[PDB]
């Protein structure tokens, strides 16, 4: 009945993030009894105003997901969020489409709860400071600001990849994300452009509280660099009216509810 405080008293500041000791989801489930079936958690102490759906683009990244779950469930709880975890699994073996799976995450999370904020997070990024809140702000939020992968530095000011957060309204305003970026690269720069063309800028925690770790990996087969990214990125202004939420089509092959998360396998079609 009491609104949660603008800042959480549970925060711990910087944390140690290492990827050696193998995790046991069963052990993780135990350490997180408040997390309900489907990966939903709501604060009992207070009322949170942040109804957050965390959306994870996914395909053959189960090991990464264990680590992701192991570190984030405790963090998101400390951040007093009313959250749900969604892993949007791309069915099949053709080209990977990150942005398109995120659009799917948005529509599918909405079927469960009236979330007002959306956090799109890659499966392999863990924040190193719980002060980096997974919620929405006055402007779209870029969350994974200082990745170890980039020397704890932002690779470029126009970078919106990794972990981002948009309110429902901010997301709706740009017709969501593009559905035509297959393979790696450029979908995030396209999204970034979308924000500018709609009068929005990017908000970010500073480079200290924004430190993140990305589990080291090689580029996945079927997600090779998209040769067309550079040309697609230059027509965002016009293509964003035709490619996005309004043109999304996919088929749900299966909905899985596990104690720590909801996983949705979908068929999003092929590069055409």
């Amino acid at each position: 009945l009491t609104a949660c405080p603008e800042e959480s008293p549970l925060l711990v500041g910087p944390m140690l993030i290492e990827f050696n000791i193998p995790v046991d989801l069963k052990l993780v489930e135990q350490q997180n009894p408040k997390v309900k079936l489907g990966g939903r958690y709501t604060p009992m102490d207070c009322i949170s105003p942040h109804k957050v759906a965390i959306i994870i683009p996914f395909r053959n990244r189960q090991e990464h997901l264990k680590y992701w779950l192991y570190y984030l469930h405790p963090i998101l709880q400390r951040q007093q969020l009313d959250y749900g975890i969604y892993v949007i699994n791309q069915a099949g073996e053709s080209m990977f489409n990150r942005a398109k799976l995120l659009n799917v995450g948005f529509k599918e999370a909405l079927k469960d709860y009236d979330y007002n904020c959306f956090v799109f997070s890659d499966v392999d990024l863990i924040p190193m400071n719980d002060h980096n809140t997974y919620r929405c702000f006055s402007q779209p939020r870029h969350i994974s600001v200082a990745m170890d992968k980039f020397g704890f530095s932002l690779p470029y000011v126009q970078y919106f990849g990794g972990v981002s957060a948009l309110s429902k309204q901010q997301f709706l305003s740009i017709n969501g994300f593009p559905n035509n970026y297959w393979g790696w690269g450029g979908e995030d720069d396209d999204i970034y452009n979308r924000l500018a063309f709609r009068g929005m800028s990017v908000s970010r925690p500073n480079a200290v509280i924004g430190k993140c770790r990305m589990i080291r990996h090689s580029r996945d087969k079927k997600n090779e660099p998209n040769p067309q990214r550079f040309d697609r990125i230059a027509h965002t202004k016009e293509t964003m009216l035709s490619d996005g939420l309004n043109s999304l089509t996919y088929m749900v092959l299966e909905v899985q509810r596990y104690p720590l998360y909801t996983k949705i396998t979908v068929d999003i079609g092929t590069p055409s």
Partner: protein
């Protein structure tokens, strides 16, 4: 070999200003182009681009794949996968003189502004 903005900036020194492109624009272009990876190999509709500059075997270098290439730079594409950038740079120079900066597709959309951030801030 995944280099960094500064190593790159230092290694690339001699290409500066050539055809009017600064080191700022090059750091920007190379990041989006190869991630600064000297061993970067990327396929593109039946052809293959190599190294830091992502030089194509379609016209610029000879590769065992398709030997008919005009091999304009007169070098084996494999020599753009090692850590000595002199020949990569020499070839990039030919591309610049013949086709121009727009060979690098990342240039116009990613490197037309906010170049300051691309400077190496270390001596």
């Amino acid at each position: 070999t995944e280099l960094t903005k500064c190593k790159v900036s230092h290694a690339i020194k001699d290409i500066d200003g050539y055809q009017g492109i600064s080191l700022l624009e090059w750091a920007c272009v190379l990041f989006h182009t190869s991630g600064y990876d000297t061993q970067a190999v990327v396929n593109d509709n039946g052809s293959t681009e190599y190294g830091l500059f992502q030089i194509s075997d379609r016209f610029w270098c000879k590769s065992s794949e398709f030997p008919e290439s005009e091999n304009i730079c007169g070098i084996s594409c494999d020599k753009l996968l090692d850590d000595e950038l002199d020949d990569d740079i020499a070839c990039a120079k030919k591309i610049l003189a013949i086709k121009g900066i727009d060979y690098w597709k990342a240039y116009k959309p990613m490197c037309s502004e906010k170049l300051e951030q691309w400077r190496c801030e270390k001596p």
